Write a protein that binds this ligand. Sequence first.
Ligand SMILES: COc1ccccc1-c1noc(C)c1C(=O)N1CCN(c2ccc([N+](=O)[O-])cc2Cl)CC1
Ligand SMILES: COc1ccccc1-c1noc(C)c1C(=O)N1CCN(c2ccc([N+](=O)[O-])cc2Cl)CC1
Lengths: 423, 430, 430
Amino acid sequence: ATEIRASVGKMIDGIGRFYIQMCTELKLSDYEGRLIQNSLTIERMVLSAFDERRNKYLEEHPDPKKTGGPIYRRVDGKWRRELILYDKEEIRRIWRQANNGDDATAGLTHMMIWHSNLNDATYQRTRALVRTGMDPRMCSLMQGSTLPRRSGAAGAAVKGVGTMVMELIRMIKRRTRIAYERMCNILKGKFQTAAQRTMVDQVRESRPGNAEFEDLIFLARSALILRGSVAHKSCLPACVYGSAVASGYDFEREGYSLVGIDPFRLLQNSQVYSLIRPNENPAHKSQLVWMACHSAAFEDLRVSSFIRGTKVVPRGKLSTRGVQIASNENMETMESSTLELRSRYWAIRTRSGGQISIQPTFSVQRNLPFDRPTIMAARTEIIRLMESARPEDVSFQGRGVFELSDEKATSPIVPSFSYFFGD
Amino acid sequence: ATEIRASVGKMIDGIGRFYIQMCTELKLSDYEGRLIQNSLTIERMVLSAFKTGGPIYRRVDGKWRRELILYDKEEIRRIWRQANNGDDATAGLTHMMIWHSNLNDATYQRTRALVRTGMDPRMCSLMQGSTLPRRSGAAGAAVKGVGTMVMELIRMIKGRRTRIAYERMCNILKGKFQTAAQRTMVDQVRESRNPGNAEFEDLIFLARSALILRGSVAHKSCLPACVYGSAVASGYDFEREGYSLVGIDPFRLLQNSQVYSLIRPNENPAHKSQLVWMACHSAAFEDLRVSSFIRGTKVVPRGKLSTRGVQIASNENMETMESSTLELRSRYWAIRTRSGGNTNQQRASSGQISIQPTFSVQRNLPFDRPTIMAAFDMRTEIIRLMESARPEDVSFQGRGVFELSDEKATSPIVPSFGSYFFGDNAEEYD
Amino acid sequence: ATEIRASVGKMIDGIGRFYIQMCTELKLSDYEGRLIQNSLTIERMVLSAFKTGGPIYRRVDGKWRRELILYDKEEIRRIWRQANNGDDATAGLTHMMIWHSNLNDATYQRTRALVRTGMDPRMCSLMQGSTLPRRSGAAGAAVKGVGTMVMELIRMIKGRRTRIAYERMCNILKGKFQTAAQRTMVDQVRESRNPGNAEFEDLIFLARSALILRGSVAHKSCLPACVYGSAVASGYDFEREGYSLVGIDPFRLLQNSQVYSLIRPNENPAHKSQLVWMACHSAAFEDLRVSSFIRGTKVVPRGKLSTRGVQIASNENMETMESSTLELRSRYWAIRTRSGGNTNQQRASSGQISIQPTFSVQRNLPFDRPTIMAAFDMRTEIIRLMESARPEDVSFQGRGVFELSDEKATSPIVPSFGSYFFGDNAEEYD
Ligand SMILES: COc1ccccc1-c1noc(C)c1C(=O)N1CCN(c2ccc([N+](=O)[O-])cc2Cl)CC1
Ligand SMILES: COc1ccccc1-c1noc(C)c1C(=O)N1CCN(c2ccc([N+](=O)[O-])cc2Cl)CC1
């Protein structure tokens, strides 16, 4: 729909306008405005100013009116770091004015999903997994685990199965009954098999101990094979949108999507910068940000490499640390470098997780192939299903990548043939 | 060095300010201002001013539209001076001229101009700055190839200010030749009263010699004004940082720049990119091997490029025009040279031009025929000198390409090895 | 065009009828009649008639048997005339001769014949139709290469009907040369009274010139009689459809034909196929690059072919002979030309023969040495003309190959590029 495309374009324009004004207030250069470290701080300032939970607390426990973070300028051939303090009310004022008077929570949530996609690409969260009571190897089900509980509509769709499992277990271990039933429906709406979905209803209609806890732990384990419906959104740093709005792109009129070609197109026409530590490889910094930009942290490295063009190395062999720079780090040795965020191909982001056999005619040495899942499928059932599926079963049949010039999904390109957090 | 960087950084800063000022006057978006076609028209207007106009392209209602607006030359002349802190600033003007010249050198073969002058059309590589006007700047004089100089001199041969202009050009050409013998011939052309056919025949001889005993011709990375303007707008100070046309600066600038181009239906945007990349680094007549190595992707001959010229004529319809990012970046960088390579010295040789059979095995027995047979007044001295030279001889010893992070050129990469851009045509397969 | 197609279609139709008639007389099966060895003997008999015989091969009891039968020349002569609707039909006879000539041109190097005539044995490419008799047909005269003509003329030099035959041959040779200078030399050889050593030395000079300033020699796709006979039998009317030796017709005929050959123990049937394919399209002295491209598979040099001649001598035993399909089809087709390529005009040049260094990088600096150095009565005029020519120069501009469904040659494919068939031997690696 043009309307869905226009309303999505409305919020990006809103982010864009806000970032522009924010950059002029801080008197940042266009290059400095496009430094991702500044973008993060600026993005962090808005979210802090609308953090109602924190703001209510600070009124109750008395500078609470001001919010800050590190900002980076190039002064006398060197990168300087500075802590800037800015009034929260004015930040909210700028946000509203940029979003045409509205408090647009969708735009804020959009910047939260971006930070979440960045965290998943940067850090493995094993410490949180063990403390809750689940396997540290369940990390591929942990998309959106750094997001808040009441995060909004888009935030709910982005969250993984294990994320929902962790949130529920923490409640079971601990008005709020309505939230428990609401969160169960979110979890249930992501399981594709009827066997998994029915098990959720048992854990939902209960007033919960070991048995319910063990159900969620089992249901999470099953999601490693019988995967859930997790939405994937391309959410870019605010500087990307700010720069495009500044250069004359109208996201409202042109429309926009987060699962289409649009973000790939935009990054092809973007130049984002990052600060780099003495012994870091810029190509690996670029890989990290690229993966975050498209929510590809838990993706197969081969399909990510095919889309990207260059090799997508796993995290353990990646010669870089996080994008953010700690307060104790020496700025005298900091250099700025371009982030290569382009791609050779593009592909649609998924919310998902004739002849069937062959009759031999010739007497030759070969395997005799057959589509097993379609032929064969014609608590107990969960184990029965998990045993059936094979690592070499094909999914998304017929679907492929596209050339950048192919604006519509006309001619797909199917590749011929993997863990980012591998041992 | 610091002083050269200062003045160079000053003129680019001027071109920058002018372009920003020019982009606001026309109410162009940032993207539109960074369309190469818009940049070329703006560059044209200020050169034509020293009424003026040309095509300006906008993105109207999802489609590219063409409008040819006009400006008073006086108003443009005022804008240029005032963007260049008062000064008339002729240097920045010839800088935009050399950029146009480099683009012409990459786009068009000028064989029709060569035959009229009685010159061999296979002298491409001698023709840098041939579309550049006679009596250009000093920067224009340095950039002009031997053949350009020869051509301009023949047009003279074919009011005694004609005499000094003839002698200045002889001196410009003389300063480019790297052997004494070639220089002595130019003196003989210069010292001549009432120049005619003898001097014409001498100049053609000198041009042929310059294909083997190559002359010193300057090479300057000169970019479209939008690249400079975009940099100034975004917070780069060329006066504080300085600038160089032959060092790393232009390579680094392009790496931090994004330029667009209008593309025709049957055109490959990568091939359009190669052409403008070549133009940007004055690389039309370079070895394709070295251009390819530096760029990181193959630099293909002119005849195998699915692209026409950058400019779009008023004849063709805009309804089918689309826009594309120009890929103008590089894997490595390399210093732009004034040198034509080794021409003399002949300090020994050191090499192997034949084999001695060790094994009783059937095969041919290779040897370098032209070199071995070669050993068996100022005109014949040149002949003997260019007969000694071999295509195999290595110039620029010890020099190499550099990583884009190697700002000070500390660590040269020497490459281990399709050479002629204008070699692949319907008449010749070179 | 229609008239040429009519008469050509008539003679092939005649050869066809003759072969069918000849195949019934010998009680050969269709397969056996389409064995190339059987076709060659039948073709031989009718040429020898104008007693005659030769080997005829049959499939007896699971094995190939050889029998040499005889026929009265008068009876064969009667069969030929009566298959050609009364007429003596000499044209169809020289057509079978040119086919034999083309096969000989592909099979044998005739260096022993060249040395006796005082000619350089490296003149292969000049020797089309050398095994063709002196005083062949007009079609035979057109097909003969420059070297063949030179060789035949020297044999004359080494009863005043000798005078006119000498002058006819000088005119045949003159009509083949494409430059005035070469033609003027032939006049000087012709106008000579009592020809001797001066004319011999002139003819060798003219032959050498024809390796660079190539002459106009005709090329005609001439197929074994079984191909024509098989087509007539199967319902093709060459008189109604017409026929062409230089257009698409023979390529299309071969595509709808299946010919067989006897193969020796150590022979590769694909290599046997290449040889007969080359012969069929008069391609012995073509560039292997163009032959390969047209055929669709690699056309390998003579010395790398694991095959002997097509004919099987009476010496060798039949017990080890097997039979194989000859692959005579093609990926594309192309018009057979009379032209020797560009020899003059010299309208400019347009190209690049050197580079100008842009980057300070270590490398050799390529240049076209022979071309650059080249610029530094009728005999020397030829020397100067062939000194100007380059191996790189492109002939047949705008012309290309065609798909087999492109009957009218509407859409030429120009190819983007091992050249000499007789280049790979024990004495030379060309
Ligand atoms: C079709 O061009 C335009 C289209 C729209 C606006 C300006 C131009 C334009 N005006 O001048 C030039 C030059 C232009 C150009 O070619 N651009 C700029 C915009 N680009 C882009 C494309 C898609 C997305 N997205 O998010 O889907 C984001 C972006 Cl930034 C594509 C490249
Ligand atoms: C050290 O960075 C800076 C350095 C100077 C100014 C701004 C920045 C800067 N401020 O914010 C970010 C982000 C920046 C950045 O990283 N840049 C911008 C300038 N760049 C550049 C480098 C060299 C040439 N030249 O022509 O030699 C041209 C250019 Cl455009 C290099 C990349």
